[model samples]
Structure formats: structure tokens, C-alpha cells
Target: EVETFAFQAEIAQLMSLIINTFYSNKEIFLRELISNSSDALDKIRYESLTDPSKLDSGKELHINLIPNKQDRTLTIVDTGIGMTKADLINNLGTIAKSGTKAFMEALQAGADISMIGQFGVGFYSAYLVAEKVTVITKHNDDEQYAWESSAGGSFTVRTDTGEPMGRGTKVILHLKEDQTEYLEERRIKEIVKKHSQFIGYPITLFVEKE
Candidate 1:
């Protein structure tokens, strides 16, 4: 079983750096998240080969982006391996699991941070552009869970009330005005192709025609 851990002070600092500095092209944030979703899909698909029962209704791996202009919200949904309550906290809130120690060690040994992209904290990048973020996730081995935060230092988690998404997770971002560039389909598609085009899963966008 995977052990859960909390973020250390340095971890929070690291997240801040990533949120603030990692992307000069702010649009790449969507690409990063989509790439992560594809990774999750790859993980579950591989796991299923070893344990067929783990497949959720035999759903195919895919990623979807839904934009709500009325609410200024962008929802990124994925049919991939979802997280549990522990995963929400450990994956989002804490740093120990982020491989920070290894990252630092790699840095000291002259390794590029970009090479360690598989680290799990990619989800937190939503905080960079969203005022509030909500994650509705359903894991194969556990009940569905809802995790939310304002990127303010605290977050809330509870049992999900909505119907399970069969498998995987959905992350909804309440976009800030300055972040509205993501609402444009052309921009979203460009970024996805640039960063996530090689991702093993299919990615789709649900957007308004221009």
C-alpha cells in the first residue's frame, strides 16, 4: 500500500516556485495537466492488464476539457486512475511525496529539474490561474472523494455526492479574468499539441466555436 505524507515547508516553497516560475508560456499549464491525465490513463491501463477487475466498466482512456464561459470555469476531465482522500492530501498538500529530496539531490548532482517531470504535484498548477479549484475523483479501490481549495494554505475533502465518473478524475478550475486566455479553443489546442500531443491517450476539447 502507498503510504501518505504531508508537505513540508520546503515543499510549499517549491510549489510556489513551480506555480510562479516554471512556465513562461502560461498556456502550457493546460498542456501539463493534460499530460498528467494521459499518464494516469497509462498507469491504469497497465495495471488493468495485470488485474482485469481494476478496469472501471472497461472504459477507454481519454481526456476531456469543458469550458463554461458563463461561470468563467474550465473543467479538465480524464478517464484515468483516480485518487483517494489520502492521495488528495499526499499528492496535493504535502511535499515528502513530491520527491523534493531527490530533486534537490539531483540538482546538487547537476541533474535538470525538467528531467524529473514525473513528480506528482502537477495538479497544483491549477492554483496558478484559478481562484478556486475543485477535484471530483473516483478511485478503483476506494469510494469517490471531492477535494477543493482556494490555493490559500488550506483545503477541504469530503465524500463525493455526484455519480462516480466510472474511473479517473475531474478537475474544475474557476478562472480568474487574467487567465481567460485558456478559454480560447485555438489557444488550448495549440498548447495541447505542443506539450501533450505525444501523450499516450486521446485528448478532446469541449469549447464554444469562435
Candidate 2:
């Protein structure tokens, strides 16, 4: 079974202007994605100190980049704090236009707990070039769940009974027709070295045959 939501203002028109304020260029999606991944790893690491029970067993924090040429999909997986169905809904909701603008102002003024934002709504950047986005994740506190949308007004989340993640999140981007260049190996590594090399964890790109 599948659920669909009419794209909020259609995805392309959704967050293009606001997010562009933070990203003057189109290629920085990886930077935002990796930064959010690092933050999730930090979250789990911090929780382990005060609440080990919140950590998943054998869940090492790392990010995996998987590009499938045949499928034309780029998967960014991270063994960090995965999301719950509720978290998915809240995180991917097509918020009221005014709310996004308001929060941006408040965040810039340090009037809000700003990290709570979705990387300046950079996650929506996926819509700039992706045909569809899939989120697969597992949280110790909640059942494994998958959230998906094509940058629609509303997304859907459901219990995941497919290939399981022992812990963390996997985001699959079904690239747009013109975005095929993202799957190139050299391009991926170049982006990582230039934008994400300073992050603590090693970034990996899976190279098994298509």
C-alpha cells in the first residue's frame, strides 16, 4: 500500500528561495546532508554517556554513500539516531509558508533553539533535483519506519518490514533527469573532500557492481 500527498506549493516552488539564502550554490546539498548526519551521530554519542539504554546494540555511527547507476538512486545512510513515525511526520511536513519565514528570522536572531530546523530546510534541497525521496530508519524507542515523498505538501510514514537497519537512517534520492552527474564516483569524493572532510567520521562510498 502507498500514500500520497499533494506537494505543498509543489516541491520546486516550496523552499527554493528560502534555502537558497543559506546555499548560494546548487551543489551544497551534500554539505547540508553530511552536516545533519554528523549532528545525528553527535546526538547518539551524547545520549550514550547519560543513557546507554537509548543506544542500539552494535550500531556504529558511520555514513555510507551508495550510488546505483542502474537504478539511478543515491542512498545516504547513517548509523545514527533514526526517526520514529512521528518524527518523520514532523520533520517532513510542508510547513505553513509563514512559519518557515518566521523561524528563519528567529533563528538568525538567535530567538529559537535553531538546530531544531531541518538544516535551514536544506533537506528540501533534495527536491531541487530528485524525483522522489525515501527515508528508511530505525530507532530503539520506536519501530523501524520509512517516510517518503516527491517534495509533496504531505508525506507518509509507515512501519518498515523490508530490509532492516540495525540502527540509523537511509535516505534514497531518485535523481532528476538532469542530476545524473551526482552518481559519478569522482564527483562524490570530490564533494566529500571539499565539503565534509573535516567531519569526525570517515565518509564512505560503496562501489560494488551495479
Candidate 3:
């Protein structure tokens, strides 16, 4: 069953502000997502110390960046502590109650905060370049699920019975036409080097052989 939830009114307004006013440093969207992936990876690694089974067999911890020019999509995949349905709802859907509204106020008030991670709104930065975002995740304790939204008023979550993710989360950004620079290896490498160079996990980019 597919379930849909409307964005909290405040978050809906904030999303518009982020998409419109957060243009000066639109590339930070990549940094935000990578940071999120790293955080998830770290969580699973830490948890596995006590519950070894938390670490999936044969799946090493790492982040993979895949850019598809033909599809106009860029995906960041990580073998991490993927979210359950509750995690997806609370983490992604309840941003309005995460004190992010105050953080947005501070940014609008001319506080020169460089990273959006502190505000917990880092994931929403995807809207800077992506018209739609899709998240497919599987947790050790729960069934696989997919969450999708177009940064509109509503988002959807559904049980995914497609290809198994094994153990991880994949965030696919459907890039806007003018934001296709994210599809270029050179540009993505530069951003990764600048923002996530020392993330402590192998961040590999998929490249096609010509």
C-alpha cells in the first residue's frame, strides 16, 4: 500500500525559500547528501560493534555516486544504517518540527553558516537542483521501503518488492534541466574534494567507458 503525507505547512513554505533563495551555493546539495550518507554509515558501523549481524554479509561500508546523463538523475548510494518506515516518516517528514524553521530564520538574518547539516535540513537542499527525490532504503530490522517526493505538497512511501537493496540506502535525485552539471564527473569530483574529501569512507563515482 502506498501512503502519502502532506508536508507540514511551515516546511512547505521553507522548501520554497530554500529552492528560491539558496541559489548562491546550490552545489552544497551534494555535500549535504554525502554528509547524510556518511552519518548513516557511521551509525551502522557503531551499532555492528555490539550486534555483529547489523553489518550485512559481504557488503563493505562505502558510498557510491552514480550519474546518469540519459535519465537526468544522480544517485548517491551507501551501505549504511538504512531507515525503517518510521525513520523515514519522522526524519524526512517532520522537518518543520526539527527547529529548522529557526535555523532558516538565522540564515535569512545574515548569519553566515557554511554548512546546513547543523540545522538538520541538509537533505532538503536536494531541491536546489532536483525536481524530484527518491529514497530506497532497507534496514536490518525492517522490510525494504521506498520514499519519493517532488518537493511539492506531498510525499509518498511504499513497500518496495523490487530488486533487493541488500543493506543500504540509495538517494536518487532527478536533476533539473539547468542543473545537469551534477552529471559531470569533473564537477562532482571537485565538490567531493572540497566538501567530503576526508569522509572516512571510499566515495567512488561510476564512469562509463567510452
Candidate 4:
């Protein structure tokens, strides 16, 4: 799963900007992901209107967050239209593009600084906090797949035999050094209050009751 593709000088230069300076701050990653989740839910919901087979029409659309401090993982999972393999390779193969935007736009969603990352360049923001990032998703018509990267401008994707995600996308962020604040339930809540409180779907943080 480690096929290698390097970056060109120009592509690297542009991506460095996206990777480093695209967002004003780092916590916007939550907002960006929230935007993506809501958009996915909306798309399938709307599509189901005409063709009910596009997604599970009866499932409640929502987003869940798991800040696993011990594991050092931040999970943002949603019940939305999971991507087909082509969609993953196309949408994420190249960091960001109008073609990617419009293609995902027709079928995807996110907003403000939130969208600039999700649709424009925000997905890369995960690296702003995490050294390694993983996406596990299950689409209505495709097998569950896993896509991962270190944000070196190249990623690997394959059919995943891991626990299946019923009908959406799950993003796991492995926080970087000094970035453990993201794993704090209180901090995560505050960030959501500031950036994603208005997200179309309910954003729930999974934490132990103590």
C-alpha cells in the first residue's frame, strides 16, 4: 500500500501554502469536517428524493466525534453519502481543484473557512494537527475503503476489510507534537462551539462520563 508518487516543485510550493497558511487557525479542521458531513448528508437526502436507493433514507443524519486521548486519535464520523473508489481517488488524488470542487460540489458540501478547507483546501488542515490522517468510508454502492497519507502530497487507497462504516465517512486525525490539546474533550467542545455550532447536523462528541 506504499506506492510512491512525489510532488513537483510548483505543486509542492502551492500545497505548502495550502498546508501551512490556508486557514487562519488550526481548529477550523473540525468546522471543515463538519461541513463535509452535513453536505454529504444533504446530498444523499436530496438524491434520495428522486431515487431512494442512493442512500439509507431512514437513517438519522448526524456527526460524531471521538477524542481518544490514549490512542491520540480524533475521529469525525458522519452518516452521509460514502464515496465510491473513483470519488476518493478523484476528490483526494489531487489536494484541491475547481474540477474537484465542482465534481464534489455537485455531490458534496462545507462552508466559509470551513469549505475552503473541505472543498478548496481545508482537508489538508488535518496535517496541521496530525502527522498521519486516515479516512474510512462506506458508500451505498461501493465497498468500504481506506485512504491514508502523511500529507506528503501522495496517498494510498485500498478496499478496507476493517470494521465497516455503515453509510458515511470517518476521519481519524493523529495529532502532532504539542497538538494534544485537540484531544481534550473540553477543548474540542469549545472549538465546536466557536466554529461548528451552526453545522446542519447534530455534532456529538464521544467522551466518558466521569
Best by TM-score: 3
Instruction: Give the C-alpha lDDT of model 3.
Output: 0.83
Clashing pairs in 3: none
What residue runs in model 4 are displaced by over 4 Å at the alpha carbon? 1-14, 18-24, 93-95, 98-115
The 10 consecutive residues of candidate 4 with the worst lDDT sum are 106-115
- Ranked by lDDT, the better of candidates 2 and 4 is 4
lDDT (tens digit, per residue) of candidate 1 on 1-210: 223233457566655665566545456467667877777788888888888888745567788999888889999998888887777877543344446666667767876445345554556566668878888988877888888766545567788788757878898999978888888888788777777767766677886754
- Over 125-183, each residue of candidate 4 has an lDDT whose tens digit, in order, gives 57667878889988887788888877666778877888766788889988887789888
Off by over 4 Å in 2: 1-13, 16-24, 92-99, 102-119
Q: Candidate 2: global Cα-lDDT?
A: 0.71
Question: In candidate 2, where is summed lDDT lowest over 10 consecutive residues?
Answer: 111-120
**Candidate 1, pairs of clashing residues:** 7-94, 7-95
lDDT of each: 0.72, 0.71, 0.83, 0.72
The alpha-carbon deviation from the true structure for residue 145 of candidate 4, after best TM-score superposition, in angstroms, is: 0.6
How do the residues 1-210 of candidate 2 rate in per-residue lDDT, one tens digit apiece? 555445445343444543334333455677777887887888888889988776645447788999998999999988887776666766543344555566556667775332324424657666655778888888777788888876424677777889877888888999978788889999889889887888998788888564
